[PDB]
Amino acid sequence: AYRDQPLGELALSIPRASALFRKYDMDYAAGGKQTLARAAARKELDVEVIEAELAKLAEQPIEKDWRSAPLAEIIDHIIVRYHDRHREQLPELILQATKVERVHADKPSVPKGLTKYLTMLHEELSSHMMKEEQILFPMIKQGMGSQAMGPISVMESEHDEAGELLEVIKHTTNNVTPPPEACTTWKAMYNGINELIDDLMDHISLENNVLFPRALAGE
Ligand SMILES: [Fe+3]
Ligand SMILES: [Fe+3]
Ligand SMILES: [O]
């Protein structure tokens, strides 16, 4: 039956199901409405195995269920858990990528263009998060969420733009897998990239699958 539920609900309801979908490159963040059945079919995956993996994870409940939490507490959580972290993590990654592309400019496995793409992500995320905090989030706190179809659609479009950059970043880095040649700086940067991708998809998932639809519905 898990195959008939949307990816978003499985990610928000089952602990560490988010990490499972990232293992299968399944987009529970922007494509959260997509059922697990239609997602496993797209990628030619054996859905029955995914269902058993979720069944094991589903033995335990999730630490915090945001699906029914107050919108104000979701917003405040997003700001300190995701927005503020992104502002610290991306400048750090940009400088690491700059150091790696130079130090290992001669290796074949070096991720050329990574610094360019991290910079693009940082600029778009920065402007994006400012708009949410200065325009959309206050609108929702004042109870005007039902009148926010316009702004939310613009934010969800930007969420898609950010998703495309993530895919470019994953390709440039062999799905964020360092080569055997990788030094310590090189390996720690990829660990930071994976941490960014994980947070950003949970960040977008929480907005697209909970905050936005519930605001539009008048909660
Ligand atoms: Fe956000
Ligand atoms: Fe956002
Ligand atoms: O965001």
Author numbering: 2 to 220
Quote from the publication:
Escherichia coli YtfE is a di-iron protein of the widespread Repair of Iron Centers proteins (RIC) family that has the capacity to donate iron, which is a crucial component of the biogenesis of the ubiquitous family of iron-sulfur proteins. Bacterial RICs are composed by an N-terminal ScdA-like domain and a C-terminal domain that folds as a four-helix bundle where a histidine/carboxylate di-iron type center is inserted. In E. coli YtfE, the best studied RIC protein, the center is coordinated by H84, H129, H160, H204, and two μ-carboxylate bridges formed by E133 and E208. We show that YtfE establishes protein-protein interactions with the scaffold IscU, where the transient cluster is formed, and the cysteine desulfurase IscS.
Crystals of E. coli YtfE could only be obtained when the proteins contained the mutation to alanine of the two vicinal cysteines C30 and C31 (designated YtfEM), a result that agrees with previous reports. The structure of E. coli YtfEM contains two channels. One channel is mainly hydrophobic (which will not be addressed in this study), and a second hydrophilic channel that connects the metal center to the solvent. The di-iron center is located ca. 10 Å below the channel entrance, which is approximately circular in shape with a diameter of ∼2.3 Å. The channel is formed mainly by hydrophilic residues, namely H160 and H129 (that are also Fe ligands), K132, E159, E125, and E162. The three negatively charged glutamates are located at the channel entrance and solvent exposed suggesting a possible iron exit. In YtfEM, hydrogen bonds occur between residues D5 and R17, E49, and R86. Analysis of the electrostatic potential on the molecular surface of E. coli YtfEM shows that domain A is mainly positively charged and domain B is mainly negatively charged. In addition, the cavity where the di-iron center is inserted is positively charged, and the negative charge at the surface in this region is mainly due to residues E125, E159, and E162. Besides these coordinating ligands, an oxo-bridge between the iron atoms is also present in YtfE.
